[PDB]
């Protein structure tokens, strides 16, 4: 290759063949002129050792180059190892029609879509926009359309919205561990420079939004658009391949919003009033006449489908709270009510999506997951669930326990100075009394947080 400066670089094969051709020509000249035997023995040893420096140089680090006596590369080193051809250029290739940026959340998305910036969308889709611009007849040749997207005119963006609409892309976080590491979405265009990824799907990537960089690929051909939509769409992967549990578990803010929404305090507004449905539970909480969690008899109507696929409607007055009713507006028809009557942390919402998928199929689990994410972020916002420094309560019994443990290590200290106990018995005794005092302090703080 030509470098710059009147100076060229190349592979080491040219240097090794230069060396082998030099030994072969020096051997032809020395056997053509009838040399004595010891000279041509040194000759054939250097030629055998030259070819053995060419076919594989790893076994004898002999072939060395100037200013840094390093082993040169060779053919077996061109095939072997991490940087040969099999692992570097055949199993995984550098791939066109791709791109990469920083991810960010944007929870207004349905989970079958993701954001994508307009600049990357125009750079990824230059061939399709070329074809549409000479299809509708706004240009003659490929270079006129190349001036049109090189100029970024006004008509190319409706063209771009007419080539996005039903075309998947493939998102990919870079250390792909399991088969959920590559999924496929549909773009929504973003005034910005960052891929807006659906939040729940983030837990499948083991991703966090502190600067992870996800890469997009484009399925060009038609069968790959159908392989992206039918096998790899983000709705068509809501269970892990490793276990039959859901992988669209609501991750961190949304379970705090639900856990704040379905609980109870013993005395808030609207205590012990009856409510005709979940609709006026929403209408009570939005006004402020009730609280979001105060216990309330309601009349709910659940549809248990114990017939042959036809849903049986039953209605009653469950003793519940208002937040459980506002959540009950979202749960679809086939589920029973007793799944929302508990506290709904992360385990209970995980088996909520599990029973929803195992009873009502796929589409109520997708739309039920989207509605859980929307109400979880909304009522997490209404929560204001902060953290302050006065929120972590020290035990009042802490220094007493630590002082008793100090007296006890004083006791075992004296018994070690008294020569009654050994070193290892002092060791096991000290670790045991510190572990016991540790558990006493832990139960003190845990009670004094949870029930105080």
């Amino acid at each position: 290759v030509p470098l710059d400066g009147g100076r060229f670089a190349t592979s080491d094969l040219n240097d090794l063949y230069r060396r082998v051709i030099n030994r072969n020509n020096r051997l032809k000249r020395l056997l053509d002129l009838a040399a004595p035997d010891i000279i041509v023995r040194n000759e054939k040893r250097m030629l055998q050792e030259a070819v053995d420096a060419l076919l594989d140089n790893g076994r004898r680090g002999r072939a060395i180059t100037g200013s840094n006596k390093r082993p040169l590369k060779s053919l077996a080193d061109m095939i072997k190892g991490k940087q040969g051809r099999f692992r570097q250029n055949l199993l995984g290739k550098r791939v066109d029609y791709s791109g990469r940026s920083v991810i960010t959340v944007g929870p207004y998305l349905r989970l079958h879509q993701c954001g994508l910036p307009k600049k990357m969308a125009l750079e990824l889709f230059k061939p399709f926009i070329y074809g549409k611009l000479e299809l509708r007849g706004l240009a003659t040749t490929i270079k006129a359309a190349k001036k049109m997207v090189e100029r970024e005119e006004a008509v190319v963006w409706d063209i771009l919205d007419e080539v996005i609409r039903e075309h998947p892309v493939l998102l990919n976080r870079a250390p792909t561990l399991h088969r959920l590491g590559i999924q496929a979405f549909e773009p929504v265009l973003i005034e910005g420079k960052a891929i807006q990824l659906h939040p729940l799907v983030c837990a499948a990537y083991n991703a966090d939004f502190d600067g992870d960089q996800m890469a997009v690929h484009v399925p060009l051909t038609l069968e790959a658009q159908l392989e992206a939509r039918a096998l790899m769409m983000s709705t068509n992967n809501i269970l892990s391949p490793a276990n039959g549990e859901p992988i669209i578990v609501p991750s961190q803010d949304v379970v705090l919003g639900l856990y704040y929404m379905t609980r109870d305090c013993v005395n808030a507004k609207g205590e012990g009033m009856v409510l005709t449905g979940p609709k006026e539970a929403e209408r009570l909480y939005r006004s402020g006449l009730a609280s979001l969690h105060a216990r309330v008899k309601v009349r709910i109507t659940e549809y248990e489908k114990d017939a042959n696929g036809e849903l049986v409607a039953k209605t009653s007055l469950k003793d519940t709270t208002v937040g459980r009713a506002i959540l009950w507006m979202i749960v679809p028809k086939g589920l029973p009510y007793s799944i929302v009557n508990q506290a709904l942390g992360k385990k209970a919402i995980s088996k909520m999506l599990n029973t929803c998928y195992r009873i009502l199929g796929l589409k109520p689990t997708v739309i039920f997951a989207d509605q859980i994410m929307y109400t979880g972020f909304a009522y997490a916002a209404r929560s204001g669930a902060s953290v302050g420094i006065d929120d972590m309560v020290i035990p009042e019994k802490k220094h007493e326990i630590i002082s008793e443990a100090e007296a006890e290590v004083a006791e075992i200290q004296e018994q070690f100075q008294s020569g009654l106990v050994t070193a290892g018995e002092r060791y096991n005794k000290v670790i045991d009394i510190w572990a016991a005092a540790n558990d006493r302090v832990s139960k003190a703080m845990m009670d004094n947080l949870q029930t105080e």
Partner: peptide, 23 residues
């Protein structure tokens, strides 16, 4: 008249430890 280019070849691995392999 030869200015043979093999006398201009960049030693492009001029920072490697000599005991490393495959390159």
């Amino acid at each position: 008249k030869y200015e043979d280019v093999m006398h201009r070849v960049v030693n492009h691995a001029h920072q490697r430890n000599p005991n490393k392999k495959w390159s």
